[PDB]
Design a protein around this ligand. Sequence first.
Ligand SMILES: Nc1ncnc2c1ncn2[C@@H]1O[C@H](COP(=O)(O)OP(=O)(O)O)[C@@H](O)[C@H]1O
Ligand SMILES: Nc1ncnc2c1ncn2[C@@H]1O[C@H](COP(=O)(O)OP(=O)(O)O)[C@@H](O)[C@H]1O
Ligand SMILES: Nc1ncnc2c1ncn2[C@@H]1O[C@H](COP(=O)(O)OP(=O)(O)O)[C@@H](O)[C@H]1O
Ligand SMILES: [Mg+2]
Ligand SMILES: [Mg+2]
Ligand SMILES: [Mg+2]
Lengths: 7, 7, 7, 72, 372, 372, 372
Amino acid sequence: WXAXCPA
Amino acid sequence: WXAXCPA
Amino acid sequence: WXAXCPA
Amino acid sequence: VLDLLDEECKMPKGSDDTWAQKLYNTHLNKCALFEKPRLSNKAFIIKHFADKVEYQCEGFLEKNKDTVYEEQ
Amino acid sequence: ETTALVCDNGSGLVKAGFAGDDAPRAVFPSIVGRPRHQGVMVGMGQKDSYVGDEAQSKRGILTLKYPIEHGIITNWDDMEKIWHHTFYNELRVAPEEHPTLLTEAPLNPKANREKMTQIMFETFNVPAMYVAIQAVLSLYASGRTTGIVLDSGDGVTHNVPIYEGYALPHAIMRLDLAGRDLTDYLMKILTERGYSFVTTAEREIVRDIKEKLCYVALDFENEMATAASSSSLEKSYELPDGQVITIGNERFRCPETLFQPSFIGMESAGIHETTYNSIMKCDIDIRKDLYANNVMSGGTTMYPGIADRMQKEITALAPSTMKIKIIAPPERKYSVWIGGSILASLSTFQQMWITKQEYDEAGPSIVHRKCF
Amino acid sequence: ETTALVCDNGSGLVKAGFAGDDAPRAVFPSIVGRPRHQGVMVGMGQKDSYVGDEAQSKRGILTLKYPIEHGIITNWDDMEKIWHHTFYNELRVAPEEHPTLLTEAPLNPKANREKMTQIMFETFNVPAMYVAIQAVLSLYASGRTTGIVLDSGDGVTHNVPIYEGYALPHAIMRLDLAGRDLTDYLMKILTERGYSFVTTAEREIVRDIKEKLCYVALDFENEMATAASSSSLEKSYELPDGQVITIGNERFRCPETLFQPSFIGMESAGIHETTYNSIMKCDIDIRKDLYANNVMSGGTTMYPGIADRMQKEITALAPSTMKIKIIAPPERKYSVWIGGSILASLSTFQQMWITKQEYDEAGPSIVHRKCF
Amino acid sequence: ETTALVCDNGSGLVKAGFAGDDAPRAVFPSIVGRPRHQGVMVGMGQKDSYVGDEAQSKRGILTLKYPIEHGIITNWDDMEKIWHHTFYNELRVAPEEHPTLLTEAPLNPKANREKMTQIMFETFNVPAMYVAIQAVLSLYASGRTTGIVLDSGDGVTHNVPIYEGYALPHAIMRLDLAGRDLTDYLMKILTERGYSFVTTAEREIVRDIKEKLCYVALDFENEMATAASSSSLEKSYELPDGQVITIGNERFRCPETLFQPSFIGMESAGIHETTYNSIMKCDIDIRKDLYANNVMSGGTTMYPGIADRMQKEITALAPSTMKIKIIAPPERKYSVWIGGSILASLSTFQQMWITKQEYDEAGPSIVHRKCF
Ligand SMILES: Nc1ncnc2c1ncn2[C@@H]1O[C@H](COP(=O)(O)OP(=O)(O)O)[C@@H](O)[C@H]1O
Ligand SMILES: Nc1ncnc2c1ncn2[C@@H]1O[C@H](COP(=O)(O)OP(=O)(O)O)[C@@H](O)[C@H]1O
Ligand SMILES: Nc1ncnc2c1ncn2[C@@H]1O[C@H](COP(=O)(O)OP(=O)(O)O)[C@@H](O)[C@H]1O
Ligand SMILES: [Mg+2]
Ligand SMILES: [Mg+2]
Ligand SMILES: [Mg+2]
């Protein structure tokens, strides 16, 4: 993703 | 209605 | 709540 | 009217009622030759070459359909 | 002959059929639904708006509007859809063939009849039309010529005294308590037990709880003590999703607001004191016949025990030498339609219709001239 | 005199203190945390569960539960821990000494007051108790006797019209839009820009992004066009770990759902139309005083521009000869507590308390008898 | 007619073919391998990097990257190689000839569609394009218009409720449990029995152990006791080199983390409670139809016994008068592609395509305008 998770 | 009540 | 919603 | 019938044969839970609704939505005011019978929602009228003809939608879809399962 | 249509727009229900029938062909809620969510599938056969039993069936997707409230039509483009559905889909008859009869609550705005007339002649092209006071038709239905009529549907309640077919306009009482305000009260009171109802699609659930569970106490404060002390009175109902709710002393509190409009913050007196005051405005030669012929009419009078409660609480007001009788036939939810069905079949009536040839000359104001 | 406690359980925040103070001694989130991982070290001084500022401090290790949602207490064993923490740790006072005053949203379930009462007398052994409607207290705070009050915290929003200290129960509107549903919407919309938030310990991050960055557009569709055309509106925030996020046209979309509950799929009208409809249910002699005294209350009304947006969009509905005033004091997040602090200090009130001697005779149902 | 391509990028697998076919022409893993060792021989015809079935075949020499993780494309230069391989080598068709249809998990970042669109028009020069929500296509495949769909592949899981082709966006649940996190858990748990797997080229072995051996317990703690007490449950597998491994009570522990994400340290509830909570967010009129039409979709739902476990553990939550049905067709791993294959063949759809003439005017942001 961009914040919470790694993608 | 038109004045007293809402219809 | 007890019906209409989760609380 | 044929294309929307073939498109209705494979759309899920298709029925002669919702086919007719697609007919009306697509053609009813947009075309000079397609008309709705005043007292019904299950028929339509085509102004053919020789005459106006009223076709009734009930049971086109079951007649329209072929699929032969090749394993048979 | 071409028989005339009888179409009791009422509110909340539409009742329609042919004159000379003994019950209507069509009874469906006068409700228009429009879809509020995003439609995602393609080729679904999306439809602009739904009328009646469709909008009831699909109600979970829709916002439901009643176009008539307090017997006043508030949205004509909905209402005309409801008439269009009534004639073409539900009765399956072209209205251009034969006359139409329409019903209205008394003392409501003058322009409502003019608009009804204008729509009936201009768009629906009916050959002739009439509008009739509902409470007058309830007497035709109950087989009487002298009466006082408590007619109470959705939307509106009114009393009309009629003596030997002379109506007494100065004594006509109108009240805006109705099934819809008992329903909105039942919504605001069921919340006490935690159940909650916030949307129109479940306002239509509360409207059916009210119909099955509710009943009227023969005396209020002792049953309030009883059902506060013994739970034996309480009853339970399955919501659509399968949740069970339970309703106790509440299920008699909402219909009892007909007798205490203070519960919803209105000033005015209940149906019993308005009935009695309407009789008191009548002149004294007729009061004995009015006291004998009290006629219940319309659906909000269907609650069990409303007859005995009325007879009790009017007998508490009437002079004790008089005799008080409440006439509550079991058909009474339909009696306005049955009365219009017989009225429209009378050969004497055929002169009364407003014909299109008259309307084209005088304009829509002709109603005030030829109707009541 | 022994001063009484004022404890505004609210939802999301607990506000507590002594009557006659001008601001609360205790403001902490009404949140209970339990540890979810395996504790590995030995001798650590492990503790079963954390309340308030502890559960906020350690939140990365915890699962955070709110025991109150939509103004209903849903877990009593949490809630009683929160009260226990309030009296003994945060105020550091034994509640057996002196009375306590409690606040509740209107029209919520009847059993909630009975349980609150039963816990206050049985476990906390308070000498006397009362429960008071929040929106009534917001008038005591704003120094008025005639008002209509839009009181909107976490959990619940409601309008209560009050004219010269007579409340108008038939006109009380309650709505379940609140800071928590703006927060869950801000979570589901921030995902558009790739940021993601899936856990309670970061729901508590989104709840603070909402507080600092969000604001309400005076007109929505022009700012939507602006911030789609110019990036000049967007602002950035540092997450706890040091990641920078950036938020643009979004930061006005979440608070604007107060005016368009369709964005989260509710039917009902926004706070402006519910305020206006609540005024319309009031009788016409008082509407001018209600229109003048519109009082904002509670924290969810803190968004910049919500005052001017309300005054605009109510003026769009009111008759143009009327005058519309929105009263938005800067304290307003605390006004329910300030009002309860003055209420509990009135010498006239000392009769009003539910004393234990009354409760022991009548049982917990006494609340419905002696409260509103 | 020119038939359109259907290309369900998914994650981990690419599924592609022509609209109107009943199964895809091309099913290969969405994996890019680069060689890590020094190539020593000369004249071998070395090639920079391998896509799909090649990287699977040669995997012992390679480092394998998935360009898509959690339904987000994280490396565009890999992904464009995968599309290039799909069109030119595997289908052997020039995409400039006829339109293309693409599928995406709901609620994922807004920029992913813009990049997909920009690449499809700019490099591949497709005449028209569309992107479709996977869970919507699973209904087209299963022949329904009213459903709630548990669609769970590699990367992402989501629930979407659809009633008569109206989706209920407020009720859409997304969860990041997936086949890849069951795989990484199966790696971290197999270590209990001493076996070890540390590289991608053997992560691809664990991924196939998971597929053959694993199954879901109808009740967890009794099978945990059984297979701790009787070895009768354990089964054995030949690694590529000929080593035999043996797996016992473990082989049901990894797929059961779908129902207890605590095993991998997530807060959130399993797929059953997210399904039920998604139904609860829906309005109460439709819940019976949602409870009847539960549709399984995507490969991670293939574990034996996941249907019966879902029906059990939802029936444990649903009201006991309801009826709960889990629809788990054997094709279901392909149902998103089958649904897109029929969707793209509908004559009604041909208007829906984003044509290049539209894109050149509006820019890549047109997707948000013209798509769902
Ligand atoms: N059997 C019943 N018992 C109690 N209330 C009823 C019953 N049937 C209908 N109602 C209520 O009365 C109203 C319908 O009355 P109705 O006579 O059909 O109205 P109208 O004739 O004006 O169209 C609605 O509010 C409905 O909820
Ligand atoms: N300055 C602010 N701006 C916007 N939202 C706020 C602000 N302060 C608090 N909130 C939000 O409003 C809610 C708190 O309101 P509050 O009035 O404290 O609740 P209550 O009084 O019911 O305890 C929370 O959801 C919080 O995120
Ligand atoms: N028959 C099966 N049984 C159990 N797990 C499977 C099976 N087939 C595939 N999987 C797992 O599920 C994921 C593949 O699911 P799939 O539906 O193909 O993904 P997508 O559709 O998103 O490309 C992989 O992690 C794979 O290991
Ligand atoms: Mg009636
Ligand atoms: Mg508050
Ligand atoms: Mg998939």
